[PDB]
Design a protein around this ligand. Sequence first.
Ligand code: NI
Ligand code: NI
Ligand code: NI
Ligand code: NI
Ligand code: NI
Ligand code: NI
Lengths: 196, 196
Amino acid sequence: HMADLSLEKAAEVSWEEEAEHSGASHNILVEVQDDGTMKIKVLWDTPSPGIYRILQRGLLGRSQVGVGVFQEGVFHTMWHVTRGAVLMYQGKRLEPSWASVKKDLISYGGGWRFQGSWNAGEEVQVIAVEPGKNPKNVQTAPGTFKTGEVGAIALDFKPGTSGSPIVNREGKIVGLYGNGVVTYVSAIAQAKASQE
Amino acid sequence: HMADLSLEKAAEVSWEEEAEHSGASHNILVEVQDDGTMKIKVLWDTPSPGIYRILQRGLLGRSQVGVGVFQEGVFHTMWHVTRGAVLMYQGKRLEPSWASVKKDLISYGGGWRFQGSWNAGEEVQVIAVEPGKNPKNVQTAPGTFKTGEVGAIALDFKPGTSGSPIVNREGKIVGLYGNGVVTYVSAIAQAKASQE
Ligand code: NI
Ligand code: NI
Ligand code: NI
Ligand code: NI
Ligand code: NI
Ligand code: NI
C-alpha cells in the first residue's frame, strides 16, 4: 500500500480486416446500381501508444483487473477498474486527471483524447485483451439503447477485459468496452475529447 | 460523485446438498470397512446477514461490479471491487475498516469475521451471484498452490461475480471467490478473523 496497480503493454490499436465476427446478427451495407450490379461496400518521451493490461499484485501472482489505452500520452481506462488509483508504469507514478463516474471512464496524464463516434448500423471491432490471452479483434454489430443514445454490445469476455477499446473501420477508437447491464450488453463507453 | 456504489441483497449463505458440480475432477472421500462394506462418507439493528450485489450507477442502468457478504454486521468483499469506496446501504454510508491488498480483501463496519479454513482434498461450494442471474451453488474441488499454501479454483463466472463466498459442508465461509491468474484459477481468498 499503495501503488498496487501497474501497467504492461499488450497490443497496438487497429482494425483487422478479416477479424473474427461474433454476435447474433450482422449489419451489412449494400450498394445497388441501376446497371444490375450489387456490391458489398524520433523517440518521443511519452508512454508508447497502445493497449495495456492493468495488473494488481495478488497471492497467486499479478492478476489483470482491467485494460486501458495510451493515446497522445494519455492513458484511458474505466472508472470501476481503478477508481482514481495511481498507476505505476516504468517506475513512474501516473495520477488521474479526469473522470466521469456516469460514463464509467477515467484518464491519466491529460484529458480524454478519443475522437471516434460510432454510428447506428455500423459494425465495430473490440480489441479484447483477456487475462492470459493474446489480444483478439472481434467484429460485432452493436445495437442502440436510449437515454445521449448509446451503442451497446452483446459479447461476453473474461473478467478483467473491461477497458478494451472498440475501433471503427478507420482504426479510430469509438469507446471502451464497458461493464454491462443484463441479455448481457455493455455500453460503448465514450466521452467527448478535451481542449485548452 | 461520490457514493457511486450501493448494495442490494441477493441470497443467504448455505451449502446446498445436491448442488450442481462443476470442474475437471471430483475429490471423493471413501470409508472402507473390514466387513466388506464401502461407504461414500427479535429484529437486530444491523444489516441483514447475506450475499449482496455491489452496484455502480452507469448509463444503461446500475451495473454489478462485484459481490460481498454481511456477517455479524460486517460487510466483506474484494479489495479490487471497491478500493475502499464508501458503500450506500439504506441511505446509510458504510466506511471501510480493514483491508489487505495482498489478499485482495476488505471489510466495512469491523474486522474480518469469517472463521472457515479450507482443507486440501475437500470440495466446496461457490455461491456464485452473477449479474442478472439468481444465486447458484456450484460444488467444485479446489487444487492447492504454494507460497501460506492456498486453495485455488478453476471455474469461470461472468464479470462482476468476484466476492461471491465459498462455503464448506458446515455452511461456513472458507473465503471469497477471487480474481485469478491464468488455466484460469482464482484463489480462495481468506484472512484470519479479528479480535479486541
Ligand atoms: Ni496509502
Ligand atoms: Ni454469425
Ligand atoms: Ni470490470
Ligand atoms: Ni468526491
Ligand atoms: Ni464431472
Ligand atoms: Ni473482478
